[PDB]
Symmetry: C3
Subunit: 231 residues, 3 copies
Amino acid sequence: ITGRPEWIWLALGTALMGLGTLYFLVKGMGVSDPDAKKFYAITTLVPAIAFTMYLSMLLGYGLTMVPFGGEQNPIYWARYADWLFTTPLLLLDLALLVDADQGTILALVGADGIMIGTGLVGALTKVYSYRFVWWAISTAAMLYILYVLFFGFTSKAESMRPEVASTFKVLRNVTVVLWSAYPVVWLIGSEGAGIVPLNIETLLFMVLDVSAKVGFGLILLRSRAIFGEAE
Amino acid sequence: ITGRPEWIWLALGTALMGLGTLYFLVKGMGVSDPDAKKFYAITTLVPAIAFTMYLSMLLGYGLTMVPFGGEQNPIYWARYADWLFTTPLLLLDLALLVDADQGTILALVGADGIMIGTGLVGALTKVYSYRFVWWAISTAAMLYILYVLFFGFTSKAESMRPEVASTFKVLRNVTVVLWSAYPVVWLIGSEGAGIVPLNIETLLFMVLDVSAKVGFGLILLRSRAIFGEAE
Amino acid sequence: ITGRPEWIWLALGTALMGLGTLYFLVKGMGVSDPDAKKFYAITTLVPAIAFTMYLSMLLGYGLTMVPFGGEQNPIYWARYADWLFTTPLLLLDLALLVDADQGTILALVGADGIMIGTGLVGALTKVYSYRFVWWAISTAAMLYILYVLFFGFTSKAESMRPEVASTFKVLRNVTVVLWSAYPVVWLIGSEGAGIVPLNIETLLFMVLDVSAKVGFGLILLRSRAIFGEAE
Ligand SMILES: CC(C)CCC[C@@H](C)CCC[C@@H](C)CCC[C@@H](C)CCOC[C@@H](CO)OCC[C@H](C)CCC[C@H](C)CCC[C@H](C)CCCC(C)C
Ligand SMILES: CC(C)CCC[C@@H](C)CCC[C@@H](C)CCC[C@@H](C)CCOC[C@@H](CO)OCC[C@H](C)CCC[C@H](C)CCC[C@H](C)CCCC(C)C
Ligand SMILES: CC(C)CCC[C@@H](C)CCC[C@@H](C)CCC[C@@H](C)CCOC[C@@H](CO)OCC[C@H](C)CCC[C@H](C)CCC[C@H](C)CCCC(C)C
Ligand SMILES: *C/C=C(C)/C=C/C=C(C)/C=C/C1=C(C)CCCC1(C)C
Ligand SMILES: *C/C=C(C)/C=C/C=C(C)/C=C/C1=C(C)CCCC1(C)C
Ligand SMILES: *C/C=C(C)/C=C/C=C(C)/C=C/C1=C(C)CCCC1(C)C
Ligand SMILES: CCCCCCCCCCCCCCC
Ligand SMILES: CCCCCCCCCCCCCCC
Ligand SMILES: CCCCCCCCCCCCCCC
Ligand SMILES: CCCCCCCCCCCCCCC
Ligand SMILES: CCCCCCCCCCCCCCC
Ligand SMILES: CCCCCCCCCCCCCCC
Ligand SMILES: CCCCCCCCCCCCCC
Ligand SMILES: CCCCCCCCCCCCCC
Ligand SMILES: CCCCCCCCCCCCC
Ligand SMILES: CCCCCCCCCCCCC
Ligand SMILES: CCCCCCCCCCCCC
Ligand SMILES: CCCCCCCCCCC
Ligand SMILES: CCCCCCCCCCC
Ligand SMILES: CCCCCCCCCCC
Ligand SMILES: CCCCCCCCCC
Ligand SMILES: CCCCCCCCCC
Ligand SMILES: CCCCCCCCCC
Ligand SMILES: CCCCCCCCC
Ligand SMILES: CCCCCCCCC
Ligand SMILES: CCCCCCCCC
Ligand SMILES: CCCCCCCC
Ligand SMILES: CCCCCCCC
Ligand SMILES: CCCCCCCC
Ligand SMILES: CCCCCCCC
Ligand SMILES: CCCCCCCC
Ligand SMILES: CCCCCCCC
Ligand SMILES: CCCCCCCC
């Protein structure tokens, strides 16, 4: 484990995702509202999945070597197995908050799968220049997601209860800022141009992951928007 | 790229799926009917997924070598990753058109997963004679799907609006004819008996894919069956 | 095939899953109740999936070698591909029986995915002591599932029709007893401590699989709880 300088950030990430999972699990014990139960189930699964994948990276299972640039490059593939399941769950939290229609939910989840799937292909591609073709396709899929979150959901939240509109607006802004950083870290990190070393890259993804999952969840599950209007 | 004679058909397929995706995306911009939005989302995702997998084959990522018959045989595995997601989406288009019940939808999607999954196992199997055992199981799963589309959905469409009944009947006939060709191309192509060479096999799958996805989508999204009855 | 002593139990399992699939398929022909169709579709898919994965193990495709303990250990990875899809389908049978809320269904299916996913990682892990870390995480996920089936569903079934309450109680008890045996067989078998040899381990999993899928299905599909109350 300790033979890799980035191990400290993988261990911290593992701990923070595990602690986040347990807090949400305990906090959700005393909840019977069927609407609130939906948000607790979605939001608790997110850091639980991330916990297992951070642990796999810490123990060395989620790491492979990819030859490109005449070098064997360490690629943590477990990140994409994490994101494949956690990013659509996070979008479902937002879509259920605004009572989005089914067709829009399917478009979001499908574009998200394309985003993560093409990012994985780009991470494992051995022809250096082709890695950035996949990065560009994946980034186009992300821009579609961000467009929908702004010019489809925002207008839908305003016609909703005030507390669900204000909570959505906050979580929307958090998501757009944090998610946009991921393609940048990829491009300048060891998967892309190799400007930033792997140990610093790992620290950046850990800060982003914890903020986008645990921080996101703390804002959502403390809001009254997750409960139905009741007397 | 150009070192493979089949590259021209992979490049054409990539272009036609990309163009198809963009047309459906633009055409769906001016749509607010929640029913129509469902069909546009399903139908636009189909060629978008196929685009990415054709590109992976063009660039050489979606290709592996499988030893059988005393030879290293080029097997494009990316086809099955495509079909795993696009064939159930196409069946969902048909099932939603006739307002199929949930139990029937689950049976269709499950049989479809078995069809594609066993076809993938057959494509990667190293014992030559066993490849055709998997082909037979996969073909049995397809025949179940075709039976349901005829002796379960057809009777349901007649009790529906006339425009949804006539549109379903057309898309049903297109699907049964085109899908039935796939097991035949597999059997006589490089995955099976090896009668037809890979470059011709690739041309045939490209014609079938574009027809079953883009051609299918053009018929559906030009129909009024996708809109609810409104004044 | 016959070069492996466990082949006899893989062949028996294949036959019993295939026969089970055909019986459920025939029995479900004469069913039009939309509620009953749901249970028949879920319950017939379970042994059909298991059939294909037992066949892959029989023919040698679903087997790999994992080095640990200074030895190349035969690991049947196809079991986890089976369980990944069949265990959530079995939980869906139970959840639909008691009309569970959506949030609870998602929590069950998500915990089940974590259970199977971490068990697969543990089966393929090359550092011997780490294999049991994954076993423990997977077992914690199972205990969560069992808790929900007892202290969330049981109370919900009592407020239901008497026949659905008594049928659920029976299937609940069958599930908790049979599922609990799996982590024990893993721990003492070739994936874990290696006390029980592989051929005996394979026999035990076959008895458990057939009972948990075909036996489970025979109890459910003979009950009147799967039909709506009708005159
Ligand atoms: C509606 C939305 C959900 C739609 C989703 C969008 C999606 C279509 C976007 C594209 C996804 C696609 C790129 C997934 C590729 C997975 C692949 C990286 C797995 C590893 O295989 C890659 C190479 C080794 O580098 O295999 C070496 C050769 C091996 C012999 C490969 C044989 C196994 C194949 C991988 C079998 C295909 C399985 C499916 C891809 C499983 C789904 C994985 C997940 C990442 C989507
Ligand atoms: C309700 C419906 C959706 C049900 C679906 C029906 C489905 C059950 C039908 C059978 C599907 C099954 C054959 C999928 C097999 C995937 C497999 C080809 C992936 C590549 O692995 C094959 C060998 C190399 O040749 O791995 C070499 C050895 C490696 C060490 C393998 C270890 C990884 C395992 C593959 C882990 C299992 C992952 C799941 C199979 C992922 C789903 C893939 C998709 C193709 C279903
Ligand atoms: C809501 C719920 C459904 C959530 C589900 C819970 C889930 C997150 C729990 C953890 C699942 C995770 C451990 C799955 C790992 C699959 C992995 C074993 C496949 C084989 O790859 C392992 C190594 C060889 O040993 O690959 C060698 C290196 C290769 C180069 C690997 C590159 C391919 C990657 C495997 C791509 C990721 C694909 C996804 C993991 C596909 C889903 C598989 C299924 C088992 C979940
Ligand atoms: C909890 C994890 C989250 C919210 C991860 C989000 C990840 C992304 C938005 C990743 C995007 C990428 C691109 C847009 C292209 C480059 C490759 C990716 C996958 C890093
Ligand atoms: C857009 C792609 C489509 C509609 C693909 C359809 C593919 C099939 C219907 C494939 C069927 C197969 C068999 C029936 C057995 C032989 C292997 C397959 C997977 C080619
Ligand atoms: C039809 C198959 C069924 C119902 C299989 C159930 C399997 C389990 C409940 C497996 C549980 C495991 C653990 C709890 C940890 C050890 C590894 C597993 C996956 C065997
Ligand atoms: C979206 C965030 C990207 C900003 C990356 C900042 C990295 C600064 C760290 C110093 C770079 C290390 C280079 C010298 C080793
Ligand atoms: C009462 C609110 C705080 C509860 C404690 C939460 C502990 C989980 C770890 C959170 C750290 C990361 C927060 C986002 C920066
Ligand atoms: C379902 C369509 C299958 C028909 C295949 C027709 C192939 C004819 C092309 C000529 C065969 C090439 C053999 C000589 C190289
Ligand atoms: C107005 C209808 C035609 C629009 C142009 C569609 C261009 C997408 C490519 C379609 C070619 C394949 C059609 C099926 C044979
Ligand atoms: C949950 C069931 C686990 C019980 C396992 C009993 C196995 C007894 C078979 C004899 C053990 C073989 C050891 C000598 C070869
Ligand atoms: C009339 C009920 C029996 C029908 C025959 C079922 C045959 C399928 C194989 C069942 C054997 C396994 C039963 C569970 C132990
Ligand atoms: C194995 C991959 C299957 C999933 C394909 C994605 C489409 C799923 C459609 C689900 C239809 C709704 C069923 C109720
Ligand atoms: C990782 C594979 C999980 C999918 C298994 C297929 C069954 C899914 C059941 C979904 C139940 C409906 C939830 C609302
Ligand atoms: C185009 C939709 C408007 C909202 C999206 C904001 C774009 C942020 C740019 C992200 C940069 C990634 C490289
Ligand atoms: C048996 C259901 C009737 C409709 C299915 C038509 C069968 C077409 C044969 C396809 C040939 C594939 C080898
Ligand atoms: C803790 C929830 C109560 C019901 C679960 C029964 C636990 C059975 C123990 C299984 C042993 C697996 C190692
Ligand atoms: C080795 C660098 C080659 C540059 C390729 C950049 C491709 C980016 C595509 C974005 C449209
Ligand atoms: C090398 C050819 C061996 C023939 C096997 C055919 C199997 C087909 C099974 C269809 C029932
Ligand atoms: C080689 C045996 C090492 C023992 C590790 C046991 C780990 C079990 C963790 C359960 C909390
Ligand atoms: C609940 C605390 C979980 C912390 C265990 C993971 C941290 C790795 C320490 C080496
Ligand atoms: C929108 C046009 C997309 C065409 C790019 C793919 C074709 C491959 C050319 C080499
Ligand atoms: C319907 C009977 C299915 C039996 C075939 C599988 C058994 C393997 C025999 C070698
Ligand atoms: C993106 C930063 C999240 C901050 C988490 C703190 C929330 C406390 C209510
Ligand atoms: C299967 C052939 C499809 C033909 C596509 C043309 C549709 C234009 C309305
Ligand atoms: C767990 C044992 C199941 C027994 C199956 C027999 C059911 C006949 C109704
Ligand atoms: C009005 C809410 C502002 C939230 C933005 C937070 C950016 C990290
Ligand atoms: C909408 C604000 C985008 C912020 C992008 C930050 C990328 C590091
Ligand atoms: C009555 C519609 C006929 C459609 C069949 C088209 C076959 C390619
Ligand atoms: C229902 C007509 C089937 C046509 C099969 C064509 C196979 C090449
Ligand atoms: C295995 C075939 C079953 C025969 C019919 C059983 C009575 C519905
Ligand atoms: C009251 C029903 C008892 C069922 C338990 C069966 C254990 C195999
Ligand atoms: C609730 C009874 C548990 C039985 C466990 C059996 C494990 C072999």
